[PDB]
Amino acid sequence: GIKGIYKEIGSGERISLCKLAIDHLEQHNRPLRLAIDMAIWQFQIQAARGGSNPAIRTLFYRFVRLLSLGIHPIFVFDGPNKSTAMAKRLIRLFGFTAHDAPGEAEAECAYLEQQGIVDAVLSEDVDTIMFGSRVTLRDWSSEGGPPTHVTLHDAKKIAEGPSGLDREGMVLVALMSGGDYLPDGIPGCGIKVACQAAKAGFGKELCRIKRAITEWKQRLLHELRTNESGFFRTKHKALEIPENFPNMEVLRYYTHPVVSSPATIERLRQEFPPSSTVDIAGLREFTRETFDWTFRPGAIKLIKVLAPGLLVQRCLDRKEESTLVKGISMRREHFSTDATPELRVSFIPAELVGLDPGQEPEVKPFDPWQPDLAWVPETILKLGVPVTVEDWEEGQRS
DNA sequence: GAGCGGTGGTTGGT
DNA sequence: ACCCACCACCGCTCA
Ligand SMILES: [Mg+2]
Ligand SMILES: [Mg+2]
């Protein structure tokens, strides 16, 4: 669901997540806020093999990636109207927000975006659009290397594009063609004639009706058996429309989905994005117990992986400049960021992270005390370490 | 969830 | 009777 939708609305725009984050940071002078439907993990994550808890090792690595993009994420969990404990623990340890939707997470993500709690939705598909989403993203994946890209769909362009499908058009598409996950849906009716029904206006109409409907179903089911207005390709005098159609309860579930109370939205308005302050000692205990990153090798490995992320996180909360960045050596506009300008920065991983390997039993190599290098987006560096970027730019004009 | 070929059915037209 | 294009649906396969 909805099967074959992308043939209608398009497959969407592939775009560097770093480009979305940095464009938004430049346009709105604050980091991108993302609602992430926690259901997107189940498929991608079950492929990591080896070690201890690989499904949530890779969740760990995606959280470090979100640290370095400078994205403020709210992770949304499904509720009962229609391991998560480690995960909610790991969310907290990274200073991210966990939110339990009352019902479907997709409906709640979309609601958080139209209330302004978040700027975009990352979900598994475009169901979010029937639920009111405007900017919806899916398929955070390589473009087979690191996951750098998402597929962007825009409700404003879709609705005025070739399909013409808007929220009520789609919604009629799922009422007519969704016979396999919604009751009282027209057998033998698929995406093609549901979509030319939507285009003929029957979705705007049904949606603007008090849950009367009889002067619509008869009007529709006659336009189908005869095609008098030529609203479709062929006649359909054999589509048996069930008497309990349109199931308006199924309509209510899309038009008025079960979302958080008004008071909960106001709570989120004051509390998200909440304070980050990555729990360094908490992540050290977590990785020791869950990944078996034991003793000094496991402390040194946490440092290598976490250090570039804290650099970014600390640059967005922000003389004291030298404490995060020792130098800049180059610039690039690499295609993996859709040409976001990045600066090559030096830093001391163990100095930046705050843990000490020698307080752990010792059991070519990587020294957390020597300088490491990372590519960081130039506009994040102008915010956090501004006079270092001047001197490099003055050095460059020399 | 999403893509793909097979397939069995409907429509409209030989 | 039969062809044909279109389509919905299904099993399969990557998840
Ligand atoms: Mg969904
Ligand atoms: Mg869905």
Residue numbers in the entry: 2 to 83, 99 to 159, 163 to 230, 235 to 341, 356 to 400, 431 to 465
Paper text:
GEN1 is a member of the FEN/EXO family of structure-selective nucleases that cleave 1 nt 3′ to a variety of branchpoints. For each, the H2TH motif binds a monovalent ion and plays an important role in binding one helical arm of the substrates.
Wild-type CtGEN1 bound to a four-way junction was crystallized in the presence of Na+ and Mg2+ ions, resulting in crystals of a product complex because under these conditions CtGEN1 is active. These crystals were then soaked in either K+ or Cs+ ions to replace the Na+ ions. While the overall structure of the CtGEN1 product complex following a crystal soak with K+ ions is closely similar to the Cs+-bound structure, the H2TH region between α-helices 9 and 10 takes a significantly different trajectory. The C-terminal end of the loop (I205 to G209) adopts the same conformation as that in the Cs+ structure (RMSD = 0.21 Å), so that the K+ ion is positioned similarly to Cs+, and the main chain O atoms of I205 and C208 together with S196 at the N-terminal end bind the K+ ion in the same manner. However, the main chain O of D203 is 8.7 Å from the K+ metal ion, and this is the major difference between the metal ion coordination in the two structures. Importantly, D199 is no longer within the active site in the K+ structure, and its carboxylate is 12 Å from the M2 Mg2+ ion. In Na+ and K+ ions the loop is less extended, so that the D199, Y200 is substantially retracted away from the active site. First, the K+ and Cs+ crystals were generated by soaking the Na+-bound CtGEN1 crystals, rather than being crystallized in the presence of the respective monovalent ions.
